[PDB]
């Protein structure tokens, strides 16, 4: 009965309310109405990250990237997913690509992207140092 | 950045 945009808006309200599995289901309903909108998959990927569902998050980021190759958030969420999975070099590349795309698109997130890069590079270093 | 669109 509701449209894809209305379902996305319902998902966004649930997300702000910290109802992550419910928000993800709402983005799934939006996808039923229009499966060609990258934002539905990026939003759902972020829900899956919060739910520790990394395999599902990775899959959504890949779907989003097939639809919008320039998506800052798909690259960023992909990098965060790879960092939590300890795939540090891939994570850093995707975070750096998010930074470059954000610069080209004149987007600013209060230094979130550089901050995440530093967190990722520090985690990678900690894993290297612990072998010593 | 960790917000929905
Ligand atoms: Na901007």
- Chain B hits for A12, Cβ within 8 Å: 4-5
Nearest C-alpha in B relative to A75: B1
Contact B4, A43 (CB under 8 A): yes
Contact A40, A31 (CB under 8 A): yes
Q: Of A114, A108, A109, whose CA–CA distance to A95 is shortest?
A: A114
- Chain A hits for B4, Cβ within 8 Å: 11-12, 15-16, 23, 43, 46
DSSP H helices, A1-132, are 4-16, 20-33, 38-50, 54-67, 72-84, 88-104, 112-129
Task: Check which CATH number belongs to the domain holding A118 and give it.
Answer: 1.25.40.10
**What Cα–Cα distance (Å) separates residue A127 from each residue in A41, A51, A130?**
31, 24, 5
Q: How was this structure determined?
A: X-ray
Write out the two tokens for A67.
Answer: 């639809």
Distance A91 CA to ligand 1 centre (A): 24
Question: Which domain covers residue A114, as residue numbers?
Answer: 1-132
Q: Of A119, A49, A51, whose CA–CA distance to A88 is shortest?
A: A119
Residue carrying structure tokens 């600013």: A108
Number of structural domains (chain A) is 1
* Residue A9: other Cβ atoms inside 10 A: 15
In the Cβ-directed half-sphere of A96, how many Cα atoms lie within 13 Å? 7
In DSSP notation, A33-59 reads H-TT-HHHHHHHHHHHHHTT-HHHHHH
Task: Resolution in Å, one decimal, please.
Answer: 1.5
């Amino acid at each position: 009965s509701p449209s894809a945009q209305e379902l996305k808006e319902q998902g966004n309200r649930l997300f702000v309310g910290r109802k992550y599995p419910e928000a993800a289901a709402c983005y799934g309903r939006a996808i039923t109405r229009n499966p060609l909108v990258a934002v539905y998959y990026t939003n759902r990927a972020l829900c899956y990250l919060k739910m520790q569902q990394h395999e599902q998050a990775l899959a959504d980021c890949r779907r989003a990237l097939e639809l919008d190759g320039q998506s800052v958030k798909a690259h960023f969420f992909l990098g965060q997913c790879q960092l939590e999975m300890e795939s540090y070099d891939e994570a850093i590349a995707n975070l750096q690509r998010a930074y470059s795309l954000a610069k080209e698109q004149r987007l600013n997130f209060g230094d979130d992207i550089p901050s995440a890069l530093r967190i990722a590079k520090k985690k990678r270093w900690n894993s290297i140092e612990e072998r010593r | 950045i960790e917000e929905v669109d």
